[PDB]
Amino acid sequence: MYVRTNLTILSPGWLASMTSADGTHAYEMQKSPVLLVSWHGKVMQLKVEGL
Amino acid sequence: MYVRTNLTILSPGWLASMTSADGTHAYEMQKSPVLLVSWHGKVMQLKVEGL
Amino acid sequence: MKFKKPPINNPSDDATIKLAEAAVSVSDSMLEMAKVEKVITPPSKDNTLTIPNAYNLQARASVDWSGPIEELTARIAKAAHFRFRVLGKSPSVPVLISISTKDESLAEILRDIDYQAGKKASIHVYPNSQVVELRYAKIY
Amino acid sequence: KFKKPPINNPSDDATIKLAEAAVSVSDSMLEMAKVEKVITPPSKDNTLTIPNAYNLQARASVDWSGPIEELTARIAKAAHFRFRVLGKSPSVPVLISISTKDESLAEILRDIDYQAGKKASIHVYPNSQVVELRYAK
Amino acid sequence: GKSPSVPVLISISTKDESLAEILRDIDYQAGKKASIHVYPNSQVVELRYAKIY
Amino acid sequence: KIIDEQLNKQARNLDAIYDFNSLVLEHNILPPVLLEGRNTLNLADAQSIRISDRTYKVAKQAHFITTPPTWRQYLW
Amino acid sequence: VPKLPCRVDGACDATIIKMMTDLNKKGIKVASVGQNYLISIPASALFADQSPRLNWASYSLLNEIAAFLKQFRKIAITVTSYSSKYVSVKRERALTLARSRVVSEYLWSQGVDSRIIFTQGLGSDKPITSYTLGGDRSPNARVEITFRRAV
Amino acid sequence: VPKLPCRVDGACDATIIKMMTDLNKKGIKVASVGQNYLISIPASALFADQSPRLNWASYSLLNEIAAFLKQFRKIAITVTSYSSKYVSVKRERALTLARSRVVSEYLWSQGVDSRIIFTQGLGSDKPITSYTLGGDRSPNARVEITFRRAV
Amino acid sequence: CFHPPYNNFQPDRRAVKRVGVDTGGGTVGLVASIYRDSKRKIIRDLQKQDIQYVEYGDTRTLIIPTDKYFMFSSPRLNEICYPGLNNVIRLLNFYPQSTIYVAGFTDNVGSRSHKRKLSQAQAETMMTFLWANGIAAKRLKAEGYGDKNAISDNAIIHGSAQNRRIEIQWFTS
Amino acid sequence: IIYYIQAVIPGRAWLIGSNGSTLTVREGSKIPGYGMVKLIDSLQGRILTSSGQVIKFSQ
Amino acid sequence: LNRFRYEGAGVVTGNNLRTSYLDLYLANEGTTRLAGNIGLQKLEAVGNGVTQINGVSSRNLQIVLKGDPKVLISGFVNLRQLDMYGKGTLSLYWIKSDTLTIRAKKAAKIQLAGIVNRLDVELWDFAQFKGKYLRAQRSFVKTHDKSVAEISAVNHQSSLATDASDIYYYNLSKTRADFMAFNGSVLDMREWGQSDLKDFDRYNKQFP
């Protein structure tokens, strides 16, 4: 799974990580039906579908 | 059989004994349907289910 | 003559009980580890030398944050009316900070942040020019 | 006439014991960090201070990632100061990467020397408007 | 001493005798594995395992 | 479902007590895991017993990681 | 549809605007400019004469304010306390700061889903009106809360 | 589940409460704190005037209190005696010790499942009240039992 | 009438209010007042609340739950249960010469020094509260122990919950 | 040997020694191990020493 | 010489006097200067006059004023109890005592400094007590209407105010208890300027 966002992924780890000059974060990692991030000091969960 | 407890085992003996620093005992022993233990100077029988 | 005992509360939960049973042992182990570490290594000084409190640092705060650092300290500086500077560079691995308290002032809050950062980063203050300087750990 | 109790309060024995354990472990971790963390003396920190010169108070934006020699030469030219270096140029030159929008060349040079650290440092003379880049050995 | 992996077991069934006699009986039944000592002026009761093997 | 929602309700203290990043080594490497036992005795057969005071074992060798784990991959 | 909620939980804009109207009717100052909301409360209706204490009935107003703040989604809250000039500057600043601490503590005890709360007291270091005949009765002495509605 | 008894046999909380209430109605002091339980009886229902002998009629109350005691589960039970100041220290100590010894022996003979029974008598060394007008009628003289509930 | 914040630390004019609302008869008002202010009625009210009272000879004790009457991990005191404290003051009005001891007990988990500090804080808060309630300081002394003389097991959750406690002892002469 | 301040007044201070030595110290006075007294503060329990160290309240 | 009672409205001045104990009864605004080393356990003055005494060292002393004198005393005193009913002003230098009980009725301006192991203060009205620089391990304060108390508690502080009673504490005690009935007030009123100030901890966050 390849994911592009501007959040900060915490839960599942990853292998490939890169960031643009504008803080956009791109990751490549193993498939997982979920993610967990922190927004502004609040932990939130993201549901991944389509698997 | 492997048993994890904190009491003292009497009847069928055992082959491997171990104790944690906390005060928890673990035993590897032969199979049995019953066990005899000492609780506070009082005898006690324990029935084994699902052999 | 009705007979009872003082503590009567709402019913508990068995899973919570088991969680507490684990947690008490974990906490005791951590306490013993901290004690032995303090014994073996004697501390020398304190960060308050490099982070001395001053006026207008007594405006009080209460936070609950368990995320990154940069925006948190930037908001703190903006509230304090202090010029923010960053030295070093943010590494690829993010530096995460978990903080939860109530009614702690700026000086001790910043000291706690610095201690929790530990080896990854450091904080310094300059009341002469109202400067908050955050320095990363440049190694390798 | 109505002071409601706190909504998220540990109104159970298990909850209150858990919260007490959390306080204890937080305190223990704080002690651990306190003893283990090393500090540095502000009387001995090796960070070049602000040259406090008027021409060093300008504002600019700069993005760079590469060798420092030409960068500091350009900065000195912008500040209208003579610039020179001493030492032997390392085979693999020192590299930095600064991206910034609105601050002053004083802080720029400060961070430059900080990132340089052991390999090289910089010195500023405002009496004779010069900047020196000193290498290591 | 150190508690041996094999525990020390006893069987006590008596009636209305002194603490000193109880302790002496305990020491007798323990025998070679452990011993009991008393320091009255310090009000101390001590047991010692047997250093053996 | 009941236990999961109860755990979710009682959230903050769980991470507060089970954080790992405070224990993670400087080099972004998870330190290994050790197992300790004391007062071990075994018998193989007649005329064959072995006694040891303490034993220490290494479960998982240390390795790098990008993010500290959490209670997520252990409780829910 | 039932799986993913249509709105943030506990959202009723009709109730929100109705309660804002009720507060302004009762005289609590409510104002919105852009994504930033501000609410001012005269100190006379809450505290006694130059006192760090509250009457019992003030808890009703406190509960109303907490219920309002529950609805919105925010990160940072700033509370400040202004007062008149009585004896000195330090005493007034201390009184304002203590009052701010008390109100902030009760708010945090209540279910305000915030991230950061700042408390400041300024005493009479910046007046709001040229009329200063009254003491604590004067409208200048008050408390103020500011925040930004973030997304 | 059917093999496992639903409860420890011969146990009924209602019966426990009823008998404890009846005992305190009779006038024997009963106190409960946590798992620690204490009971106290004046010597007027057990012995003659400073006598190490047991009145025959007292056996009914002895049986009742033993029946109540056996209901719970224990490890060790302590019985202590307190007396007035009559002749010396030695005489009082010996009398208290004899009383405690006899009552402990009878209790142990009765069907009580206590692993350990401790007995002692301090005579007139730790008075419970300053009112010492009466002799054996004084509430200060007494025999008491204490125990810790076993889970 | 009355004020929830302990009526601003003044004696209550309660019997006059009761007889007035009764007349709104004298005899029934008086019997209502005696029924209300009867010492045994007060003790029954304390039993109705989560407070225990123990009498034995001439020394008497009172048992208070730390969690129910305190903010968690806070030397502050919850104001919700103020009727219990009012009853405490009214009852202690009946012993105007007894000396006072107050002590606190906590659980078995955490830093022992921290436990001692918390117990001291709770005990001092209670003693100062009574001092404000109007008894001269020379008659009182506070003490917060650690976890020495437990009344229940600490390895059991409910046992520890019962264990954490506040005790008040007073003699007669 | 270490000294401490106990009672502080404008102009006059009360000094205790590690051995229990008492002292009623004015601004002009030589104090052993610390040299000469110059200035005292009522607001802050800090007294500068001619030798160059600072003496505060005990803990 | 053990006793001196002065009536006659005169001027008295003396220095370099030595004694064990003496008792003084001053009257009629006798302007009195004393510059000797004197111990004493009793002292009384009518009022409306000034009095200076340099050097006092006694094991005990008890004083209760009646009029409105202007007294200043230097030395070391172990005091027990003080009462005030007029418009008095008093000041000391050092006190090595453990138990003090102070009652104030009408007006007293008291400047005290020293060591106290236990202090009780009662203020009725128009009593301004500046016990700054007077460190006390145990402090109890009771203030009625129109009272001002500057306190220097150390470890354990108890304070109750009825209404319009101000109590400012210039030190953070390890245990604080403050209560206001109608319009009481208790404030830290500290400097905020020192570089080594300490903030609240678990055993301090008591809120007014």
Author numbering:
A (entry chain EH), B (entry chain DH): 311 to 361
C (entry chain DD): 23 to 162
D (entry chain Dd): 24 to 160
E (entry chain CD): 110 to 162
F (entry chain LC): 76 to 151
G (entry chain DK), H (entry chain CK): 38 to 188
I (entry chain DL): 42 to 65, 88 to 236
J (entry chain Df): 208 to 266
Paper text:
Legionella pneumophila is an opportunistic pathogen that causes the potentially fatal pneumonia known as Legionnaires’ disease. The pathology associated with infection depends on bacterial delivery of effector proteins into the host via the membrane spanning Dot/Icm type IV secretion system (T4SS). The Dot/Icm complex of L. pneumophila is one of the largest known T4SSs. The Dot/Icm T4SS has as many as 300 protein substrates, a striking contrast to the H. pylori Cag and B. pertussis Ptl T4SSs, each of which transports only one virulence factor.
